[PDB]
Amino acid sequence: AVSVSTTDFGNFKFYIQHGAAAYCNSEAPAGAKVTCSGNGCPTVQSNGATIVASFTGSKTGIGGYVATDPTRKEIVVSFRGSINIRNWLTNLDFDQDDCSLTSGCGVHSGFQNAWNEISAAATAAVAKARKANPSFKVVSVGHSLGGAVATLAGANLRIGGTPLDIYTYGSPRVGNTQLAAFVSNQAGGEFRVTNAKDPVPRLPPLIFGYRHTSPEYWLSGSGGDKIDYTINDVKVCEGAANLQCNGGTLGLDIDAHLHYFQATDACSTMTDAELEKKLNSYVEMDKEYIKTHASRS
Numbered sequence: 001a002v003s004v005s006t007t008d009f010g011n012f013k014f015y016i017q018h019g020a021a022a023y024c025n026s027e028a029p030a031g032a033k034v035t036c037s038g039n040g041c042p043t044v045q046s047n048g049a050t051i052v053a054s055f056t057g058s059k060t061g062i063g064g065y066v067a068t069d070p071t072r073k074e075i076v077v078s079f080r081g082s083i084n085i086r087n088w089l090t091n092l093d094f095d096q097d098d099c100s101l102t103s104g105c106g107v108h109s110g111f112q113n114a115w116n117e118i119s120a121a122a123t124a125a126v127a128k129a130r131k132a133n134p135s136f137k138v139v140s141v142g143h144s145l146g147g148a149v150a151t152l153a154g155a156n157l158r159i160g161g162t163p164l165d166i167y168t169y170g171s172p173r174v175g176n177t178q179l180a181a182f183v184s185n186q187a188g189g190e191f192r193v194t195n196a197k198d199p200v201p202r203l204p205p206l207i208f209g210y211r212h213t214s215p216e217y218w219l220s221g222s223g224g225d226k227i228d229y230t231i232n233d234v235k236v237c238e239g240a241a242n243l244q245c246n247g248g249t250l251g252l253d254i255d256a257h258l259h260y261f262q263a264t265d266a267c268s269t270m271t272d273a274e275l276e277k278k279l280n281s282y283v284e285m286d287k288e289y290i291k292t293h294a295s296r297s
Contacts, residue, residue, distance in 0.1 A: 001236075001238070002215050002236055002238055003236055004217060004231055004234045004236060005231075006231065008191070008217075009230070009231040009234065011167065011191070012167075012191070012193055012217065012261065013261040013262075014043060015076075015139070015141045015167040015169075016141075016143060016169050016260045016261055016262060016264065017036070017040065017041030017042070017043050017044045017262075018034075018041065018044060018049075018067070018076050018078045018139075018141045019078060019081075019141050019142055019143035019146065019147070019167075019169055019260075019264065020036060020040045020041055020143065020262065020263070020264050020265075020266050020267055021034050021035075021036050021040060021041045021044055021049075021065075021078060021267065022063065022064055022065060022078035022079055022080035022081075022141075022142065022143075022146055023036075023040075023080050023081070023083075023264075023265070023266075023267040023268060024036060024037075024040075024267040024268060025051060025054060025065050025067075025078075026054050026055070026056060026063030026064055026065050026078075026079075026080050027054055027056070027063070028051045028054045028065060029051065029054070030051055030052060030053055031050060031051065032050065032051045033045070033048070033049065033050055033051075034049035034050065034051060034065075034067050036266060036267045037266070037267060038263070038266040038267065039262075039266065040262075040263070040266035040267040041266075041267075044067075044069075046071075047069050047070060047071030047072055048069065048070040048071060049067045049068070049069050049076075050067055050068055050070075051065050051066070051067050052065075052066040052067060052068060052075075052125045052126075052128050052129035052132075053065065053066050053121060053124070053125035053128065054066075055118045055121040055122060055125070056118065057114055057117030057118040058117075059117055060110070060113055060114045060117045061082075061114070062079060062080070062114035062115070062117055062118050062149055063079070063080045063118075064077065064078055064079035064080060064118060064122060064142075064146075064149075065077075065078055065125075066078075066122070066125035066126055066128075066129055067129075068129045068132075068133055068136065069136075073133075073135060073136050073137070074136050074137050074138065074139055075126060075129050075130060075133065075136045075137070075138045075139070076138070076139045076140075076141055077122060077125075077126055077138070077139070077140045077141070077150075077153060077157070078141045078142060078146075078150075079114075079141075079142040079146045079147075079149045079150050079153065080142070080146045081142065081143050081144025081145050081146030081147070081170075081264070082144055082145045082146075083268070085144060085145075085200065085254065085257060085258075086254055086275070088145065088200075089199065089200070089203075089254075089275055089279070090269055090270050090275055091269075092278075093108070093109075093110055093204075094108070094203075094204040094205070094208055094210075095108070095109045095110075096108050096109060096175070096176065096204075096208075096209065096210070097109045097112060099112065099175060099179055101155055101156075101159070101179060101182050101183075102178050102179060102181070102182040103178065104178050105175065105176070105178050105179045105182065106175055106176035106178070106179060106209055107152070107174065107175040107176070107179055108148065108172075108173075108174060108175065108204065108210070110145075111145065111148040111149050111152060111174055112152060114145075114149045115149045115152040115153055115156070119153070119156070122153055123157065123160065126138060126157060126162060127162075130162065137163075137165070138157070138162055138163065138164050138165070139164065139165050139166070139167060140153055140154040140157065140164055140165070140166045140167070141166075141167045141168070142167075142168055142169075142171070143168070143169040143170055143171075143260060143264050144169070144170050144171070144172075144200065144257065144264070145171075145172065145200075147168035147169055147170065147171030147172075147192070148168075148171050148172050148174045150166060150167075150168055150171070151166055151168065151171065151174045151183060151190065151192075151213065152174065154166035154183065154188075154190070155179075155182065155183045155186060158186055158187070158188065163187060163188055164188045165188050165189050165191075166183075166188070166189070166190045166191070166192075167191050167192075167193075168190075168191070168192040168193065169192075169193045169194075169195075169260040169264075170193075170194065170195060170198050170200055170201055170257045170260060170264075171192050171194075171200075171201060172200045172201065172202075172203045172204065173201075173202075173203065173204055173206075173210035173211060173212045174210075174213075175210065175211070176209040176210060176211055177209070177211045177240060180211040180212055180213050180214075180240050181211075181240065183213050184213045184214050184240075190213045190214075191215075191217055192212070192213060192215075192216055192217070193217045193218075193219065193260060194216060194217070194218045194219065194245065194246035195218075195219045195223045195246075195256045195257065195259060195260055196219060196220070196221055196222060196223030196224070196226075196246075196249070196253065196256045197223065197246070197249035197250060197251050197253045197256055198223070198246065198253065198254075198256045198257040199251065199252055199253065199254065199257065199279050200257050201246040201247065201257075202243075202246060202247040202248075202249065202279075202282070202283055202286070203279075203282070205282040205283075205285060205286055206241055206243070206247065206285075206286035206289050206290065207282070207285045207286055207289050211240040211241055212240055212241075212242075212247070213240075214238045214239050214240060214242075215236050215237065215238045216236065216237045216238070216242065216245055216246065217234055217235075217236060218234065218235045218236070218237060218245040218246050219233055219234060219260075220233055220234070220235045220245075221233050223253065223255075223256035223259060224253065224255055224256060224259075225255050225256075225259055226256075226259060227259060227261060227262055227263075229261065241289075241290060243283070243286060243287060243290060247283065247286060248283060248286075248287060249283070250279075250280050250283060251276060251280070252272060252275055252276035252279060
């Protein structure tokens, strides 16, 4: 099977700093020092994390940066999430375009467009700090929608030749059965962490083709605004369509999406009961789907 480990959990608590950092260093000039206010990413600042380049896709809001860690001897590519997530949920962004990563590959427009808007810069930056530190390994991070785009850049950077390791937090499903499989089976790891009943890790809906990457390192707790989870609060659900963890949960605990070992937001058209019902409705459909395919495969 698959499980969690001492250093596996340490990596988890460590990368959201780069995730939460994308929320304000996605404008930083080369040479600058990755920095966060509100203890957003103290460890990153303790080491000598520096920007190789930052970038932003005007037409799409995506933003990201490539930094080098003199201490960790690694190169990280961080993409920022939504500054207005509850907004994103009310708009139900589910339309999926075609993808050319694998046969019959489907992907979520937005995420792919965002990746496409800033891919060239993103790529070169990874290379620029790749040649300048030929020993360092690479990592692709991102929290929230930021994590979605983080998976694609991982998938593409890989086919690009440079091996990866993607770390995500509260990421929404990014593509369909075969795109999720491609990345899953793609050499390297895709550690996606989910917090309690965060409503975004279960979108878009299973019923709409969207699947996930395996495994899933779920933080089993009340979450809410909880920050003190530990290895022993972790669960591990494997498989594309598994709802024994995050997916399969309910409510509108957005607070949890905003808390993964720390505050995500440290750096910086419908009611509530309403948004919550619609979302519930979906996971209620996703379960009926899984239910009715039990005897398949």
